[PDB]
From a paper:
[name]–[name] contains three [Fe4S4] clusters and a mononuclear rubredoxin-type Fe2+/3+ cofactor, each found in a separate domain25.
To verify that the enzyme binds archaeal lipids, the protein was incubated at 40 °C with a lipid extract from a Methanosarcina acetivorans cell lysate to allow the exchange of archaeal lipids into the active site.
Residue numbers in the entry: -1 to 375, 380 to 397, 402 to 499
Write the structure that this text describes.
């Protein structure tokens, strides 16, 4: 064995803060911890030690300025955001309901299993948005979740509100069932929705039977069909990855998304996180980590995408630092922990093969130049020109006009969000974020968390502490018993 780090974790029994050791063992990264009352625990932290060490070099420590709570009990008990948090809200979640038209066996929110209805008012949601916009820099992206947001009749008005509040990106996490109605999808599109974060467990029926309790695959494909018909070209497929259920369909999901790249902008795989409601078989067997996913991509894409093509999230953090000094304005920085997730971008050519952007562009060299020019940054245009002149030396699909890609990359360096958006329409994002549970919790990771829930009590809580420590507290305070809520609201709320 070989000790890598010391950190703090949580006891899976009593959720107490306990010491933890991260160590290399048989080519894998495991985490060991000891609760003074419940003994010692062991879990797989990362399935590949070599990729763990490689990602460790992209560490980036951010900074916050606007807080909502104070230091009282220490991390992870002071969410949030307390003075010791190291990242501002990049993507915010607002749970608009705990009601749902499904009853999935796997659900980190554990919806419908409380006998109480949590549905913040339009005015509560606007106040939560104001808290998010008060940050420095203001939160640029917001996602409605739950729960199933489409069971609220005012969801189009909520989407319009997010646009009126200044959010550049408005996202909808949904099972997509109500989106089989093409007129409703039109209402969401006209309301200003940016992206549909679509639950999508596989390309065959069995993953939906195991994870959702029924075959939703025809409904999923109908949603994709309706998105083509109305021109909604920003869909992200979200497979909950479970070993023994859909780890064999990683390539199939990618290939199906590539066939529909006109509407599908990405696939964000989510390894099953043992929070909320998990069936006893998935809880015991289906533990999979980020490098295990990277291995599945390389195996099930026949080498088209390799482990060299995947980068951690904070690798692009210096890009925001460069634009920040280039414009003298605070920019949202992807300062999450290097072991929270990974991503790559691929182009789809004529035959259908997948060319990662790392295949024909020296991304590691581009980031190297960006880091070099941060110290040096009339001279700023020369720096941009030097970058513009050094970009051809770091460069491929024939159907890709590489000259417009260069212009969009350089425009992104000028805080041009519309260039960032247009650049994503040329590519297919393949990513994976592994949310922590009580078994693999790492305080050093969650301190840099960039994905936060806005709560009705004026707090902003990192995703991984909210779903392990805070969700029941918050929802119970602001919920109404089901029997009384039904008798005071219509089916739409
Ligand atoms: C270069 C490589 C080596 C990799 C480098 C590192 C890599 C980590 C960098 C990643 C950067 C990336 C996240 C940046 C995304 C920017 C992008 C969203 C900007 C907008 O990009 C354009 C959007 C569409 O937006 P519009 O054009 O405004 O609206 C069009 C509208 O439909 C009009 O009808 O499509 C595009 C849609 C996007 C693709 C959507 C991305 C969504 C995220 C993946 C969502 C992540 C969610 C979290 C895991 C939280 C989940 C919470 C849940 C569990 C409740
Ligand atoms: C060029 C090639 C070779 C390499 C890089 C490829 C490229 C596609 C990567 C892009 C990475 C970006 C972070 C870079 C953007 C850089 C910014 C400085 C651009 C600034 O312009 C947009 C600013 C808004 O600024 P103002 O409000 O002041 O006008 O951020 C507003 C935009 C922000 C970024 C909103 C982001 C929205 C999404 C939904 C947030 C997701 C958050 C997750 C933590 C990330 C996903 C993680 C994976 C593992 C799922
Ligand atoms: C918001 C997205 O999260 C997915 N999802 C639901 N439960 C879990 C879990 N335990 N782990 C990971 N992802 C999950 C949903 O299927 C939806 O697509
Ligand atoms: C707990 S998941 C909440 C979002 C939505 N119900 C989905 O499954 O995609
Ligand atoms: S996760 Fe962040 S906000 Fe929450 S207690 Fe830790 S440092 Fe503070
Ligand atoms: S995972 Fe989503 S769709 Fe399934 S029960 Fe939970 S909230 Fe509803
Ligand atoms: S939500 Fe969890 S996995 Fe994602 S950045 Fe925050 S702490 Fe890391
Ligand atoms: Fe304990």
């Amino acid at each position: 064995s070989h000790m890598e780090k010391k950190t703090l974790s949580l006891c899976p029994i009593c959720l107490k803060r306990i010491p933890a050791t991260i160590l290399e063992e048989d080519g894998k990264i495991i985490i060991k911890k000891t609760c003074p009352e419940h003994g010692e625990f062991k879990d797989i932290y990362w399935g590949d030690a070599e990729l763990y060490k490689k990602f460790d070099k992209y560490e980036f420590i951010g900074k916050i300025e606007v807080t909502n709570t104070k230091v009282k009990n220490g991390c992870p008990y002071d969410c949030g955001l307390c003075p010791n948090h190291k990242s501002t809200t990049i993507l915010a979640n607002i749970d608009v309901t705990n009601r749902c038209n499904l009853n999935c066996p796997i659900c980190f929110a554990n919806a419908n299993k409380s006998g109480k209805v949590y549905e913040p008012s339009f005015e509560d949601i606007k106040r939560m948005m104001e808290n998010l916009r008060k940050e420095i820099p203001p939160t640029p992206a917001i996602q409605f979740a739950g729960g199933e947001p489409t069971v609220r009749s005012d969801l189009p008005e909520l989407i319009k509100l997010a646009r009126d509040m200044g959010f550049l990106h408005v996202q909808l996490a949904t099972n997509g069932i109500k989106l089989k109605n093409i007129n409703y999808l039109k209402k969401l599109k006209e309301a200003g929705l940016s992206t549909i974060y679509l639950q999508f467990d596989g390309i065959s029926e069995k993953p939906y039977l195991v994870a959702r309790g029924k075959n939703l695959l025809p409904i999923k494909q109908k949603v994709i069909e309706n998105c083509k018909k109305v021109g909604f070209d920003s869909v992200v497929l979200v497979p909950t990855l479970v070993r023994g259920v859909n780890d064999n369909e990683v390539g199939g999901i990618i290939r199906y998304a590539a066939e529909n790249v006109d509407v599908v902008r990405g696939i964000n795989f989510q390894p099953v996180s043992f929070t909320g409601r998990v069936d006893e078989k998935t809880l015991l067997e289906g533990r999979i980590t980020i490098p295990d996913f990277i291995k599945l991509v390389e195996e099930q894409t026949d080498g088209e995408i390799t482990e060299e093509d995947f980068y951690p999230v904070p690798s692009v953090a210096p890009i925001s630092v460069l634009v920040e000094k280039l414009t003298n304005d605070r920019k949202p920085t992807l300062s999450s922990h290097q072991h929270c997730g990974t991503s790559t971008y691929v182009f789809v050519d004529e035959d259908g093969k997948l060319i990662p952007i790392t295949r024909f562009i020296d991304v590691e060299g581009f980031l190297e130049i960006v880091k070099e020019k941060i110290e040096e940054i009339m001279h700023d245009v020369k720096v941009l020109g030097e970058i513009a002149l050094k970009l051809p030396s770091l460069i491929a699909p024939k159907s890709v006009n590489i000259k417009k890609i260069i212009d969009l990359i350089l425009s992104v360096l000028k805080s041009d969000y519309s260039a960032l958006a247009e650049l994503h329409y040329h590519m297919l994002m393949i990513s994976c974020m592994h949310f922590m549970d009580a078994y693999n919790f790492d305080v050093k990771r969650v301190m840099r968390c960039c994905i936060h829930y806005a709560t009705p009590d004026d707090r902003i809580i990192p995703f991984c502490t909210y779903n392990t420590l805070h969700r029941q507290e918050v929802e119970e305070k602001f919920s109404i018993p089901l029997e009384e809520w039904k008798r005071m609201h219509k089916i739409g709320g």
